[PDB]
């Protein structure tokens, strides 16, 4: 429970940093749709969760490098929050 809350804080820091760095990298490329923070934060969630909606994605080199940072840090930190909430529900099954 104490470690699960830490992984949540790590995930939020990746999302805010990944959203800010994506806008900073994509602005300047003709045709980039990842140019505002409110939806770049939504893109960082799509990346961390790998939900695959395919509506926003980076088109630049650094914007894709920022995505790789959000991929490695996001999928890992989200997998921890997923596994932590999975063990919590497992304990609720034995309690019944």
């Amino acid at each position, epitope marked *: 429970w104490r470690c699960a809350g830490a992984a949540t804080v790590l995930l939020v820091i990746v999302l805010l940093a990944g959203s800010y760095l994506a806008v*900073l990298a994509e602005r300047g*490329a*003709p045709g*980039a*749709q990842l*140019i505002t*923070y409110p939806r770049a934060l939504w893109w960082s969630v799509e990346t961390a969760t790998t939900v695959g909606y395919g509506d926003l994605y980076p088109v630049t080199l650094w914007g894709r490098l920022v995505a790789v940072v959000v991929m490695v840090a996001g999928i890992t930190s989200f997998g921890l929050v997923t596994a932590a909430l999975a063990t919590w529900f497992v304990g609720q099954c034995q309690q019944q």
Partner: antibody
Framework: QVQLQQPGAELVKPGASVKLSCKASGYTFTSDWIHWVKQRPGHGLEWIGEIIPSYGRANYNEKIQKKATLTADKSSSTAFMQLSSLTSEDSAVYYCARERGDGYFAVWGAGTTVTVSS | DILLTQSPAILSVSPGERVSFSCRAS??????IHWYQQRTNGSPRLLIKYASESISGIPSRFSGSGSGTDFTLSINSVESEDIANYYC?????????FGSGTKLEIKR
């Protein structure tokens, strides 16, 4: 109060340079981008470039002639634009606008009436 | 490069009736359009943000609509202080582009 302050006018000789200022005031965040819009007399608004002062990175209009240099100083909260090698085609009112990173230009300046003549 | 074509360029209106400013985009941009007002010897004033969301202080006579490529700024019952140039601007793709503009004429 006036959130974005700009000088009244700037007279320059054909072929010279000038540095337009845009003094800011009020709330300032790290997600704030400063833009610049050119409006020639009798014409519509024309985007020139954007800059985020908290980082120092600036982008410019690739479809027109790149005759500006966007700089910013975080201490005085004032953004600058270096209009160099100006001609008759550069006599316009240059507005600066603040963007909260969400896309729109919520607050504008007063515009600097730059005239290029001998 | 999004091409925001505003048509018509001059809108002649009778007082008290509803008017509509059309702003077509070169491609589908969702609802990432914004409307600005600039009067004579003035600065552009934001009217509508994100197609329909209103701005504090702007009179609610200004109403926005449209999505995809076609967008509409509507003034329910016009008045004298509405005589200005109106510009639409997109933020869906970089760079941000403006529209050709539309002037509002009143037939008094």
């Amino acid at each position: 109060q006036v959130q974005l302050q700009q000088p009244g006018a700037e007279l320059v000789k054909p072929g010279a340079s000038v540095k337009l200022s845009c003094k800011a005031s009020g709330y300032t965040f790290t997600s704030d981008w400063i833009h610049w819009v050119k409006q020639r007399p009798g014409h519509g608004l024309e985007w020139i470039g954007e800059i985020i002062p908290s980082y120092g990175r600036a982008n410019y209009n690739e479809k027109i002639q790149k005759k500006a240099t966007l700089t910013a100083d975080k201490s005085s909260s004032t953004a600058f634009m270096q209009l160099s090698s100006l001609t008759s085609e550069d006599s316009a009112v240059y507005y600066c606008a603040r963007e909260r990173g969400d896309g729109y230009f919520a607050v504008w300046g007063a515009g600097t009436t730059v005239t290029v003549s001998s | 490069d999004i091409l925001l074509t505003q048509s018509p360029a001059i809108l002649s209106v009778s007082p008290g009736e509803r008017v509509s400013f059309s702003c077509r985009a070169s491609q589908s941009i969702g609802t990432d359009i914004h409307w600005y007002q600039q009067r004579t010897n003035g600065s552009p004033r934001l009217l509508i943000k994100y197609a329909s969301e209103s701005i504090s202080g702007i009179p609610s006579r200004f109403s926005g609509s449209g999505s995809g490529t076609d967008f509409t700024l509507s003034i329910n019952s016009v008045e004298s202080e509405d005589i200005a140039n109106y510009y639409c601007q997109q933020s869906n793709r970089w760079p941000f582009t403006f529209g050709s503009g539309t002037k509002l004429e009143i037939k008094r």
